[PDB]
Design goal:
Oligomer: homodimer
Entry title: Crystal Structure of Pseudomonas aeruginosa Tsi2
CATH class of chain A: Mainly Alpha
Chains A, B: Tse2 specific immunity protein 2
Number of domains of chain A: 1
Distance between the termini of chain A: 38 Å
Structural class of chain A: mainly alpha
Radius of gyration of chain A: 15 Å
Keywords: toxin inhibitor
Assembly: dimeric
Shape of chain A: elongated
CATH topology of chain A: Helix Hairpins
Helix content of chain A: 55-70%
PDB class: toxin inhibitor
Strand content of chain A: under 5%
Order of helices and strands of chain A: HHH
Largest interface: A-B, 19 and 18 residues
Number of strands of chain A: 0
């Protein structure tokens, strides 16, 4: 089974792609947006499975950050 | 301990972010190139691990696709022509 560093990278990358697609929905053709919206529910299901695995890892290894810090949106994009 | 569908999503999301960073490094005046490259090392190590995990998740007679199809570059599949 996967290394904890791999879980961190996967969690980070899935969160980033979800935010990047959400941002485009408003100016997208509704026809195209409606199709993305269904794909994005699949991303969220994968995100939950990943969180469950990471929580198990937190009980087994030392030196790992809290889950909520991994999925935080970077400040440079907020302010 | 991840479902096949979860592994497929992770693989494609990591590949997509990798393409985005590759594009930034190939452009004019990349900022903090040494650090972008440090990030890419990490992404590739995760990609290798996810690939081994996907392989192990396949049944002996699975209906799931080859790993190489998941990470193929979208632009490489396109063709473009104006009307004559």
């Amino acid at each position: 089974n996967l290394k904890p560093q791999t879980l961190m990278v996967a969690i980070q990358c899935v969160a980033a792609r979800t935010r990047e697609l959400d941002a485009q929905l408003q100016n997208d053709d509704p026809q195209n947006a409606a199709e993305l919206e269904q794909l994005l529910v699949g991303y969220d299901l994968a995100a939950d499975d990943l969180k469950n695995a990471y929580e198990q890892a937190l009980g087994q290894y030392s030196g790992l950050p809290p889950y909520d810090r991994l999925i935080e949106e970077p400040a440079s994009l907020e302010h």
